[PDB]
Amino acid sequence: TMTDPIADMLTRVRNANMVRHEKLELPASNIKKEIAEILKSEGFIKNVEYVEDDKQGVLRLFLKYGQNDERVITGLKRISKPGLRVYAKASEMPKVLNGLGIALVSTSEGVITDKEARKRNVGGEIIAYVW
Amino acid sequence: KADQDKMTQALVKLQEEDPTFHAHTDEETGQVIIGGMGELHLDILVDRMKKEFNVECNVGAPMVSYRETFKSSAQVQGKFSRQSGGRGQYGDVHIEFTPNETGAGFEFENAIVGGVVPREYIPSVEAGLKDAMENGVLA
């Protein structure tokens, strides 16, 4: 059955980006919403909407394509997984694409990007890479 | 035979201790021959090998390498024809064997006229004669 909702969400984003879809509806959760908001703030997606419907709720992402229809999101990679979880210290926080990408991290100070983790001098579970 | 290496080492050491005592292997007969200044010398050395080196050995008259030869001449023919199927195997020769003068060695003559035996195979005929003569025909 389903075993990694974060991975499912990232894979939904990847598949929609490949097909050059505009929007994306997925079941919602707090961690997913925080990931989507981080993506919007960083500029990888155009917009995020939350539908507080019955059951679980829904997250509606709107993807962003540059000029010439170029895709802003090159790739997403789940790093920590149910089968093997990865954590990193502040001094060992990884740089995605030499800094051109973000690493979404989950920290005691909320889920943030690797830049914020390094700035605040914290570590945590490296949720994902996005470049 | 389990003490043959010990035997070789003992022989070497004995030769080093005694210049006049020699040991050598004979290729034709394969036997190891011990040479000495006399029966008493060799007897003492044999006893010494038996006890000091604990290599019991037996001694005898060395074997003599004999040779064979043809006393009478004759023309002969060798034919090997296995043509049972497919690509077979064929060969034919007519050779005159003659007693050579003693000490002159083997002499091969090629009196082929008209290419009855192709010039490619004549060296093979000579090599076959040499190989077959290496093995004795009588003893």
Binding site: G83, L84 | D5, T8, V12, T25, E27, G30, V32
Partner: protein, 135 residues
Amino acid sequence: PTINQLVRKPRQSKIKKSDSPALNKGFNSKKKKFTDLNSPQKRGVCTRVGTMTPKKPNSALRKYARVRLSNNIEINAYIPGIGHNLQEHSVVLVRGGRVKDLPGVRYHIVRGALDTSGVDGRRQGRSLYGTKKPK
């Protein structure tokens, strides 16, 4: 495999065999047993000396000796160079390195060591054949 599968049964590397097994074994006479010691060369005694025909496509009469080593192992050793002075019961030094043509010959006899004589007339690469500098 899954990470759980790898934890349960970790990965196992292929084991490597030596090309010169006879040099990796010693013999203790007092205990009458073998021992694992790596040697660069071993002394031996030529049990037999002769010539062998190489495997096809090559053709020649390659000089070789069947040698019993100091560790009691019997091997075939090629005799390099032109001409040799070896016979049965000769004491020779044997090093590793097989001769591709000869199937069962996996070692070389050092030239200019123990009984084996240097190559006569050799002038280039003499050290490989145990020949003194003529000068």
